Design a protein around this ligand. Structure first.
Ligand code: G77
Ligand code: CL
Ligand code: CL
Ligand code: CL
Ligand code: NA
Lengths: 99, 99
């Protein structure tokens, strides 16, 4: 699709068999999702945004569908205010910015 | 142009007579620039991101050149760690996300 930006670019994602809403975010290096259970081990990461830093759990090689496109990669889980799809997964679905 | 997302989508902007580097950020509703002076009236605002909120100054009707394309809109000025071009100005340069 071609998505204009007059509204937030929200899409449906599927992770762990569950549908969630998430923001396509070119300003995010990484994908960050609200608290949920994911399989396997995690590693620590601290990420910085506009109001300071949050600690998150880094899960690697997680299967996630984004707007009907399959991706497999790193998902950070933590107290993010919104679910964000960052460039690590936007590149896997072939997204570009165009003007 | 077509901007891929392998790296941060940074562009040059001109604002307030100054050249700056800023991130094209589909996850940002508003445009937020590091502390600088702008002419005219402003009012305070609180904006929230990862980590929490920061206080900014809201200036309306500010002209900004983004990668060579002129646009006018509201600009928020405050202690953001990155200059971000949000949707309020991305729309005006005709930017879309495509996949
Ligand atoms: C600020 C930019 C440089 C980074 N953010 C992405 C950004 O698009 C953010 C996404 C986002 C977070 C949030 F907590 C709430 C949101 F609604 C959206 N937007 C934002 O703060 O807009 C704010 C939203 C609200 C208030 C103002 C106005 O527009 C901009 C600002 O609307 S971030 O959410 O902090 C973010 C995401 C992943 C991420 N990955 C990282 N990886 C590590 C290696 C560096 S750092 C990092 C930071
Ligand atoms: Cl990844
Ligand atoms: Cl505006
Ligand atoms: Cl349009
Ligand atoms: Na003004």
């Amino acid at each position: 699709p071609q998505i204009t930006l007059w509204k937030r670019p929200l899409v449906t994602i599927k992770i762990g068999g569950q549908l969630k809403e998430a923001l396509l975010d070119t300003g995010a290096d990484d994908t960050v999702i609200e608290e949920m259970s994911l399989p396997g081990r995690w590693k620590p990461k601290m990420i910085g945004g506009i109001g300071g830093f949050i600690k998150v759990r880094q899960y690697d090689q997680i299967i996630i569908e984004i707007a009907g496109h399959k991706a497999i990669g790193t998902v950070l889980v933590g107290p993010t205010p919104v679910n964000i799809i960052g460039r690590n997964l936007l590149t896997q679905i072939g997204a570009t910015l165009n003007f």
